[PDB]
Swiss-Prot record, chain B:
Family the entry assigns: Belongs to the SPT5 family.
Annotated organism of origin: Homo sapiens (Human)
Motif (UBR5-degron): 55-61
Residues of the full protein shown: 274 to 755 of 1087
Lineage per the UniProt record: Eukaryota, Metazoa, Chordata, Craniata, Vertebrata
Binding site for RNA: K288
Name of the protein described by the UniProt record: Transcription elongation factor SPT5
Amino acid sequence: MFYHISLEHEILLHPRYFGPNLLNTVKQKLFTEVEGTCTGKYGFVIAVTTIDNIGAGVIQPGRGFVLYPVKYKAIVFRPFKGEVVDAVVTQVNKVGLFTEIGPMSCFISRHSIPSEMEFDPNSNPPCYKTMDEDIVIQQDDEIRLKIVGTRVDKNDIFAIGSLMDDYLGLV
Amino acid sequence: KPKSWVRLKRGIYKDDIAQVDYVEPSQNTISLKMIPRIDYDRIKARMSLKDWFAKRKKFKRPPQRLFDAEKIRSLGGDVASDGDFLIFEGNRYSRKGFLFKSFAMSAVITEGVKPTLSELEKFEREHNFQPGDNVEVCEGELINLQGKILSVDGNKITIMPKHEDLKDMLEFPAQELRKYFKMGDHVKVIAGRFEGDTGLIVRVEENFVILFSDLTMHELKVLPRDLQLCSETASGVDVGGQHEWGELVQLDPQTVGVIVRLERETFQVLNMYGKVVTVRHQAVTRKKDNRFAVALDSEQNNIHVKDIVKVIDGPHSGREGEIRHLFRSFAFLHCKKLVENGGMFVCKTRHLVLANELIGQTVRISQGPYKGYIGVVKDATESTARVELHSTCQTISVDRQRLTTVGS
Amino acid sequence: IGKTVTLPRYTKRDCSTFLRTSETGIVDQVMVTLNQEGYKFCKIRVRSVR
Amino acid sequence: VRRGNSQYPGAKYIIRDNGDRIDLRFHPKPSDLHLQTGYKVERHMCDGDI
Amino acid sequence: QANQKRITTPYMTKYERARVLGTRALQIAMCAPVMVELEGETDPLLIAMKELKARKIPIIIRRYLPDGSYEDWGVDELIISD
Amino acid sequence: QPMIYICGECHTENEIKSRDPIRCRECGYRIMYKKRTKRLVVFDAR
Ligand SMILES: [Zn+2]
């Protein structure tokens, strides 16, 4: 779920970068670090809007590295359990459907799919369709998937979705 | 008790697991069915048992293998049939292959005995409740109530569950206690078809919970009791410490890889080419890491191990990693932000870019202020050498051009 | 005193006795005997000129 | 470092940026003697040291 | 604590001098940019001493009062007794 | 290989082999001494 927060991060600056552009280097390293980080608490990190401030750098005893605490408003995307969200199919096969919501990769199983949709291996592009064939879900389509499960994976959360609920499908 | 696992103290069958058949306290003897230990070379050469015992001092014991009558028939040994059992060298063998024999209770071990899973496999109620797990009250007056496992015990767990809007704690035994979990939550399987696995449940059937393993997109149905709730990620600790995470292995002489993922049965070793190939524990053999190795790069600069480099070209683009293993034309990079391949990838070294014979001899100093002195070389560098003087109780550094070895 | 022990680079672990660190001198003399239990038993006297 | 641990006004180690320690007693290859800014040297005590 | 009124001694305590010199010398050793002419000098400690004399040390001392508040002083702002 | 040792009592030379129990073949005396080395030894007369 796309969101905007003000977070805090501490960065260690090697004294090599103690030049006139110290603050520029600080912000650059903050971008390089926080950008793209996925954490359990704050979900994924999409981008960094701005830097709230640069707390006074402390000089660690016995190590010239200077610790800078920096506050910064950055966009995140933390999904949940049980929320319909737009998704983009990226590959269809018999085991289940694959869809994408920004950075998060979601998928759909043969239980989450209603009983109407069936596997059609003879279909050259694998697809989920019922006897009426009213709705056919192929690759790249937009589907409404109620998230069900979530799991941290090497500091990178991945979610599992579902569409068993009414109307959850292509539109 | 009949059908119990025991062990032996001494003899040629010591340290062998066995199953009880019958016990005779009056005779002080018990019958144990175990895997036979028979030497085929002995049968081939037709040696006597008494001779084998006479020369037992320098003779190695035979291994454990299932009995085969055809093997002895081929080897020329005599095999006799007595109903279900077969008589060979005064011993009764079962049709399956297990060896039944009688031994004294004193020799047999009946305390501190517990078989291993592999042993049980060759020979071929319980509860799993731990703190911090959600359980339901399937039976009893208070039904359809979910509580946390605050305590744990044996036959009668006597848990103190905390139900919804229920500060007080109840008392339920193991049988009344049941393991149930809500939708869209982490679940781990301690015991099952694929034990030590984690997944998410799309539903919870009355007796067949369904989960999807993170390792692969396949359904996994397990008993709800065998299921457990654990927010902690699957550790995947290797058993027997045969291989460590990020450890070089030599699957083939031409190809060398690093183990990036650890699993109960299979391995996912990353080879130089960068692809992922599955192998087993036994097949893969550990290879030593080149603590000091040389290579080449595009910049034509010296590159060593554990050096931050950038993949400006090649299979990966704009990728940063730390070298962990080195090859003539390949290098293994490491990271912690990379989901793929457990954070370990491989890229070419060239594509990577920057981001004694005199020792122990007796020598005479033939020039300089120490001319005439004699000593023993303890450590000589390519140009200078350390000479311990026999006379002055002191070791000095003398240019090797001022030394002449003294010949006998 | 080059000494070795039979293990349960193979089948032998070094148990030699080295000269004390930072010391130096010349081996004055060596004596070899059997201890109370017949085992070979060697004493080495080393002299250093101070 | 070129002097090494033998020549008294020398050094005993080269701790690279990685944190590894390069021993200068058991003569290593000259490549290992290379120095750069991040590195450091356990130079022998010299006059003026506190 | 508002810096408009700083009741701590205007002088730089010997401990402050020692720690500041050590820290700046460590930085100079790890190649932080220098702030004064380096003419004919390489010792990080001597360079830090030169910087201290020049009042060009780019450090600020945060002294903590017993109350838990603190005062922040530019290094140059403190009298250099020794 | 030879390993000549001097017996303490009779001051007699005698070979001894490794694993050989230490005992002078001549007098049964159990104390022996290694003979002075042959290595070149020098002493500045300081
Ligand atoms: Zn004698």
